[PDB]
Design a protein around this ligand. Structure first.
Ligand code: HEM
Ligand code: HEM
Ligand SMILES: N#Cc1cccc(CNCCc2ccnc(-n3ccnc3)n2)c1
Ligand SMILES: N#Cc1cccc(CNCCc2ccnc(-n3ccnc3)n2)c1
Ligand SMILES: C[C@H](O)[C@H](O)[C@H]1CNc2nc(N)[nH]c(=O)c2N1
Ligand SMILES: C[C@H](O)[C@H](O)[C@H]1CNc2nc(N)[nH]c(=O)c2N1
Ligand SMILES: [Zn+2]
Lengths: 413, 408
């Protein structure tokens, strides 16, 4: 593998040099002869597998704090080693855990919000033992992160996996999402993406209101046990009704969204330890709601109804009626969040900050992995600077990983 | 191994077997993906390349291992042996050029791949010859507005000292001028080329849309200037179906998109001069040509005339202005009966083409980064389509700008 890889920005002519890729730990899916960069997805670890993984991370941690080679460093290496030998695992110090989560975010190729990576509140919930305990921690996370509209990024880390038969898991894919109900007639009420999960919740005992925007309950699994339902207190679920600065009729659509974007199905890997339940949250880029949640055909799919209210010619596609509605919807989303003083960032500002962040990373770290396919916003791509930016993709560790949906693996008791 | 690709909207799963056929690299490795990087002979090298191509040619016409296939292999071997190169049959040239289009990972218009007018210009010897051939191409392809896809193929490379080259990156483009006050008149992407034209004798009109002359190099010789006769150059005045003030922007574009700077590789032969042309997807003009900061950069002007609040980025004024520009471009071309496809229609056709390719060919190489339109990405179906990228031959490759190689 080559020592220096250059990427270029095609609108500013800036060239950056990447050395960090040499520290790549995992496979990307690509080979010499095929590229899988647009493919969405291209039992525990033995003692022997864990030893070098742990050392790798510990070395890296003591390297970050400018104590590489120190007594404290060597002592820590030895402590971790004995712990692995005697217990087949080890426990992270609170300092290491914090470093590891911040760096898993820093290494997330697909997150455009990474300029903020070092400002992350880490709630250590490794003492949790029950689903009620998980609910408590989760509620505290939500309230802290929401902060009455002034969102602050955060992660709550439940205990690491042990034997695989005692995982903690948040079954929800996000802490806050709306239900989706399939009708006997084929139509979907609510969010079609969440139909399967809503069916599971209803089966577990949830009494559904059956509306368009029903906040799903939390489904919480502690210590490998069956999961349990909890309704998040409504006063902790900040929501924004969507209106438009020009079109008075826009509020008549009755749209709203939740303020807090919180991913809860990913797995946090630090030094070979797997934290299978690690809900994290930041704040929204407008396009996530205005383009994807609202306009994807398999989601809320409102383009037709908005365009109809805009009295647009909808016969030919070459009128770009879809395109026109899309912009107005995204204008509305940004306008509504800013009006109710809930943090949100537009795709222009976010991508511009990411370019600045990426350049700084190259300067100070010798690189910054990024996934162009995810980093480029799903509307008006080329009018943002990331589009013109060459990016290298590669997986560093600590990292956030995907994991199977828990209903597919859970052994019911 | 067989690879699945999934559409996340429709949930359709195609199975790729075609990728197993490729030998050329893509630039990625197992640990690093370079999917967004713009750019990641001898007798001995030449025959296996020749044999490969001839084999897939006789296979595509169900005459594999036939007498004709055998004699042809013999013919090509003897010819490489005694001349260090070899010449393609007419049939092979056509098959080869259509398949270079078909294999073009980055081209969204490939549903049309087998409708390609191939112009064999291999008898060419001079730049005057080149200009004649190109004018015929332009006139045929333009077809009064009912565009027809074409490629013109000039003599293959020999020793590298005798390349045929179209110095222009496209047959039809607009000049670009560095103003004394630091700004750029016309197309900034062509400032250098324009200067090379001016240095060479071209008297520039110094306007915002001056069709550049052709600069043609034949047989490794100094390039020569030629003006395409204006009556062969179809141009569209851009206007808007609601905004009457839009024509007052004075914007115009040319109807014929013709890439002239690439290299067509067939059976290990290199055709350094092979201008090809299709028709426009609207975004190429409306999004990239008109709205890139490094290009015509009109967003500010347009949003001005739309009286938009331009103080904050979160007003999405850029996005608004963008949609209108692209509406205007489509409306204009359509009003002039000049062929053009919008990004919804085109991407739809591409999904259909992918499905076709998977059925009959076991796959379709594709560059998601290039296939997804540079506006309204996820409201087009290609955004939700997993694409596998790999390099098949025959192929269109990039090559150096000739003013970095040529000695005078
Ligand atoms: C602070 C404001 C943040 C912004 C503006 C932001 C922005 C984004 C966006 C737009 C996506 C694309 C999601 C999609 O299209 O499905 C994303 C993905 C992601 N972000 Fe963030 N993010 C933020 C905070 C965070 C934090 C705090 C973390 C972790 C500690 C994080 C880690 C990730 C990861 C791991 C993904 C990939 C998710 C997946 O693959 O499904 N982000 N981010
Ligand atoms: C028939 C109508 C066609 C349409 C609508 C179409 C569409 C497109 C578009 C939108 C691009 C992206 C250009 C860019 O963003 O720089 C592209 C690239 C390309 N097309 Fe086409 N195309 C057509 C015909 C053709 C033909 C006839 C050929 C060859 C015989 C061809 C070969 C290519 C190649 C090699 C590229 C890559 C260009 C590069 O790498 O710079 N296309 N096509
Ligand atoms: N696997 C998978 C998979 C495929 C498509 C979309 C997905 C969602 N990924 C995260 C989406 C999402 C939602 C809310 N918030 C955030 N978020 C919050 C902070 N950073 C991102 N991200 C997962
Ligand atoms: N090198 C290089 C390089 C990098 C990015 C874009 C580029 C231009 N690509 C072609 C643009 C263009 C122009 C006119 N016509 C067409 N066109 C027509 C049919 N297919 C493409 N394409 C070159
Ligand atoms: C097929 C393709 O990879 C898929 O649709 C991707 C494209 N890029 C994306 N980019 C972001 N940010 N989020 C997504 O969900 C996707 N989906
Ligand atoms: C850096 C990045 O690869 C570059 O900006 C690409 C992105 N995708 C593109 N897609 C198309 N169709 N045409 C282009 O010129 C580009 N440019
Ligand atoms: Zn790749």
């Amino acid at each position: 593998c080559p020592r220096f890889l250059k990427v270029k920005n095609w609108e500013t002519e800036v060239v950056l040099t990447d050395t960090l890729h040499l520290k790549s730990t995992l496979e990307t899916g690509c080979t010499e002869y095929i590229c899988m960069g647009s493919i969405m997805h291209p039992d525990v670890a033995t003692k022997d597998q864990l030893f070098p993984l742990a050392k790798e991370f510990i070395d890296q941690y003591y390297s970050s704090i400018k104590r590489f080679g120190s007594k404290a460093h060597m002592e820590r290496l030895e402590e971790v080693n004995k712990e692995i030998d005697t217990t087949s695992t080890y426990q992270l110090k609170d300092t290491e855990l914090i470093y590891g989560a911040k760096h898993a975010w820093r290494n997330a190729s697909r997150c455009v919000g990474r300029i903020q990576w070092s400002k992350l509140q880490v709630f250590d919930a490794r003492d949790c033992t029950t689903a009620h305990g998980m609910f408590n921690y989760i509620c505290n996370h939500v309230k802290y992160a929401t902060n009455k509209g002034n969102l602050r990024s955060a992660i709550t880390i439940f205990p690491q996996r042990t034997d695989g038969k005692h995982d903690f898991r948040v079954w929800n894919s996000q802490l806050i999402r709306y239900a989706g109900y399939k009708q006997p007639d084929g139509s979907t009420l609510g969010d079609p993406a969440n139909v399967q999960f809503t069916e599971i919740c209803i089966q577990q005992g949830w009494k559904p209101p059956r509306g368009r925007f029903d906040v799903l309950p939390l489904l919480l699994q502690a210590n490998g046990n069956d999961p349990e339902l909890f309704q998040i207190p409504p006063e902790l679920v900040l929501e924004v009704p969507i209106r438009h600065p020009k079109f008075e009729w826009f509020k008549d659509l009755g749209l709203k969204w939740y303020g807090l974007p919180a991913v809860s199905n990913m797995l946090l890997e630090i030094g070979g330890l797997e934290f299978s339940a690690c809900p994290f949250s930041g704040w929204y880029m407008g396009t996530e709601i205005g383009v994807r949640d609202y306009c994807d055909n398999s989601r809320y799919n409102i383009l037709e109804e908005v365009a109809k209210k805009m009295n647009l010619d909808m016969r030919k596609t070459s009128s770009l009626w879809k395109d026109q509605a899309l912009v107005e919807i995204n204008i509305a989303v940004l306008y509504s969040f800013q009006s109710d003083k809930v943090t949100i960032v537009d795709h222009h500002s976010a991508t511009e900050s990411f370019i600045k962040h990426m350049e700084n990373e190259y300067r100070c770290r010798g690189g910054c992995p990024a996934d162009w396919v995810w980093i480029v916003p799903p509307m008006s791509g080329s009018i943002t600077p990331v589009f013109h930016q060459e990016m290298l993709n590669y997986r560093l560790t600590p990292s956030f990983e995907y994991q199977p949906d828990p209903w597919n693996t859970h052994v019911w008791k």
